[PDB]
């Protein structure tokens, strides 16, 4: 068969930051060539593996994670990076074997009023663990007094949405991010490049 990497990259819609969307790719053969050919990607940064030897390598599983963040926050999606998104919304381990790819999505992910469909985890009590998702909508108990379900002084919504206007600057302009995590457990190698 053929690995459906392109479906992830060419998906019509992409997941929000508040919940990254992950698809596990297994028992297929992929050409990493199509990814490196395309000039669409603004960010092609590989951590823990050289891109050249990827086709030669065989991986037990290959996970593709999809989300849409503001362009500057793309730098946050990297090993050992401290930020609101990296610490809370989506986290990458210090030992990371995979690549981060990103392209501008202002053509599709922005409206004149702004798209509020994609949101980030503004407040969380503890930093999220690597490769973990939390969609909790409990109001942040910033105050000593409990929130008791009401938005109030020292009480804050867990999430806040980007407002994506095409006129907005590149950092605030949307960027679409695919994270490729390469998994080599002590298991049979399901995914390999034909070469």
């Amino acid at each position: 068969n053929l690995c459906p990497f392109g479906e992830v990259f060419n998906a019509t819609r992409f997941a929000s930051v508040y919940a990254w969307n992950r698809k596990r790719i297994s028992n297929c053969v992929a050409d990493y060539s199509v990814l490196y050919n395309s000039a669409s990607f603004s960010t092609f940064k590989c951590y823990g593996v050289s891109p050249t030897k990827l086709n030669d390598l065989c991986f037990t599983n290959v996970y593709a994670d999809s989300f849409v963040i503001r362009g500057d926050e793309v730098r946050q999606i990297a090993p050992g990076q401290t930020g609101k998104i990296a610490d809370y919304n989506y986290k990458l381990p210090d030992d990371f074997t995979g690549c981060v790819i990103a392209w501008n999505s202002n053509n599709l992910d922005s409206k004149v009023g702004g798209n509020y469909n994609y949101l980030y985890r503004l407040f969380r009590k503890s930093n999220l663990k690597p490769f973990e998702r939390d969609i909790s909508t409990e109001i942040y108990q910033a105050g000593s007094t409990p929130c008791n379900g009401v938005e109030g002084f020292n009480c804050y919504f867990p999430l806040q949405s980007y407002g994506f206007q095409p006129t907005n600057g590149v950092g605030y302009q949307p960027y679409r991010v695919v994270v490729l995590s390469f998994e080599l457990l002590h298991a049979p190698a399901t995914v390999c490049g034909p070469k």
Partner: antibody
Amino acid sequence: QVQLVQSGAEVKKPGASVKVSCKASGYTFTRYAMHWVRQAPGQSLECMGWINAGNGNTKYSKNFQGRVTITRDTSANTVYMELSSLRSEDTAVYYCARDLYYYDSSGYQHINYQLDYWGQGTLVTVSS
Amino acid sequence: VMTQSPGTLSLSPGERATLSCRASQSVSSNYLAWYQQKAGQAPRLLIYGASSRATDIPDRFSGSGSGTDFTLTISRLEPEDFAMYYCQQYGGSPRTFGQGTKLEIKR
């Protein structure tokens, strides 16, 4: 936590050699790179060079070149800066900092400009 | 070098302070990063990439990027904010650190 620990303050006679050590903790030593930045008293920061802990590969600034050697020990997660033939102008505070290295699609290593964490700083007084 | 102005920028408590870094070929669409240095202590990063903040940085700190130049913003001034602030980027020559601006408050 992520901790960078630097050697104690040093007093050295002119023309001698200073060796300043930066310990690493809380992160994978090989996966990040170490930069050394010097602050002369009441002056701006200057990046002397960068060590890649995995590769051992070194690059140096031209102004400080000819005196600075930056080394590494994989075992103790400790990076060393050595400066030699100290001039009086050399007296400064020297810092160690951590930069992620990334890989381009062609496979060549590159340094992320961000200096995420900093060492406490070792002071070198050069006095007759 | 990178133009960080002035050598001293002074601001009243509760006011908003703006620190400016400008360069032509250093920025070159590359990233600009800001650090905070308290008196007698090593620099601590405040903003990386001019719009993203590390953890343990209060929300009052904020940044912007405008082509050749970028800025550091402290909307609310507190005694703790008293420090020397720096800007960094990469150029054709190795990475460049700005001269730095000292922030002062009325007391």
